[PDB]
Amino acid sequence: RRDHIKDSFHSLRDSVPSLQGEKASRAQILDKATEYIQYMRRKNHTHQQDIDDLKRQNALLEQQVRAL
Amino acid sequence: NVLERQRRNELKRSFFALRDQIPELENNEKAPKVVILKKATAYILSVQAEEQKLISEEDLLRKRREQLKHKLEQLRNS
């Protein structure tokens, strides 16, 4: 199983962009993955709220184009 | 020595901190180490796939907004 933990560590490591080209320690791999998930959750939330704003702006512009 | 005993404990805390961020394993004490790593890997790939989808949705919406404004300006100028 310890070879599979080694491979899974390498797979987690390659998926974190701040760890590209660096052989970080196991603690640094876990820490950077935790920070990356934090960063991405806030980033996708901000994006989803931007998409909500665009849908509402477009819905109003459609109502302005209609009635004209 | 005393150093690796502290290095193994910090590693153990790091595993818990990573695990408590995966919604599937959150607060799951019985989650093995290889399960934390593989679920963290699959979760990271899923939020990277989500970022791509949202940027794609955002780009289409922006494209529609400027086409609805061009349509409105054309109508207001007949």
Swiss-Prot record, chain A:
Result of changing residue 68 to P: In PCC; does not repress MYC transcriptional activity
Subcellular location: Nucleus; Cell projection, Dendrite
Expression across tissues: High levels found in the brain, heart and lung while lower levels are seen in the liver, kidney and skeletal muscle.
Effect of residue 60 to P: In PCC; does not repress MYC transcriptional activity
Region described as Leucine-zipper: spans on this chain: 47-68
Span of domain bHLH: 1-40
Listed result of changing residue 40 to V: In PCC; does not repress MYC transcriptional activity
Residue numbers carrying N6-acetyllysine: 32
Effect of substituting residue 32 to Q: Kept nuclear localization. Loss of nuclear localization
PTM annotation: Reversible lysine acetylation might regulate the nuclear-cytoplasmic shuttling of specific Max complexes.
Family: Belongs to the MAX family.
Entry function: Transcription regulator. Forms a sequence-specific DNA-binding protein complex with MYC or MAD which recognizes the core sequence 5'-CAC[GA]TG-3'. The MYC:MAX complex is a transcriptional activator, whereas the MAD:MAX complex is a repressor. May repress transcription via the recruitment of a chromatin remodeling complex containing H3 'Lys-9' histone methyltransferase activity. Represses MYC transcriptional activity from E-box elements.
Subunit structure, interactors included: Efficient DNA binding requires dimerization with another bHLH protein. Binds DNA as a heterodimer with MYC or MAD. Part of the E2F6.com-1 complex in G0 phase composed of E2F6, MGA, MAX, TFDP1, CBX3, BAT8, EUHMTASE1, RING1, RNF2, MBLR, L3MBTL2 and YAF2. Component of some MLL1/MLL complex, at least composed of the core components KMT2A/MLL1, ASH2L, HCFC1/HCF1, WDR5 and RBBP5, as well as the facultative components BACC1, CHD8, E2F6, HSP70, INO80C, KANSL1, LAS1L, MAX, MCRS1, MGA, MYST1/MOF, PELP1, PHF20, PRP31, RING2, RUVB1/TIP49A, RUVB2/TIP49B, SENP3, TAF1, TAF4, TAF6, TAF7, TAF9 and TEX10.
Illness: Pheochromocytoma: A catecholamine-producing tumor of chromaffin tissue of the adrenal medulla or sympathetic paraganglia. The cardinal symptom, reflecting the increased secretion of epinephrine and norepinephrine, is hypertension, which may be persistent or intermittent. Polydactyly-macrocephaly syndrome: An autosomal dominant syndrome characterized by progressive macrocephaly and post-axial polydactyly, a condition defined by the occurrence of supernumerary digits affecting the fifth finger and/or toe. Additional variable features include ocular anomalies, global developmental delay and autistic traits.
This protein's name: Protein max
Organism the protein comes from: Homo sapiens (Human)
Curated annotation (Swiss-Prot), chain B:
Chain positions found as N6-acetyllysine: 12
Domain notes: The 9aaTAD motif is a transactivation domain present in a large number of yeast and animal transcription factors.
Name of encoding gene: MYC
Disease affiliated with this protein: A chromosomal aberration involving MYC may be a cause of a form of B-cell chronic lymphocytic leukemia. Translocation t(8;12)(q24;q22) with BTG1.
UniProt protein name: Myc proto-oncogene protein
Species of origin: Homo sapiens (Human)
Biological role: Transcription factor that binds DNA in a non-specific manner, yet also specifically recognizes the core sequence 5'-CAC[GA]TG-3'. Activates the transcription of growth-related genes. Binds to the VEGFA promoter, promoting VEGFA production and subsequent sprouting angiogenesis. Regulator of somatic reprogramming, controls self-renewal of embryonic stem cells. Functions with TAF6L to activate target gene expression through RNA polymerase II pause release.
Post-translational modification: Phosphorylated by PRKDC. Dephosphorylation at multiple sites by the PNUTS-PP1 complex promotes MYC stability by preventing ubiquitination by the SCF(FBXW7) complex.
Cellular compartments annotated: Nucleus, Nucleoplasm; Nucleus, Nucleolus; Nucleus; Cytoplasm
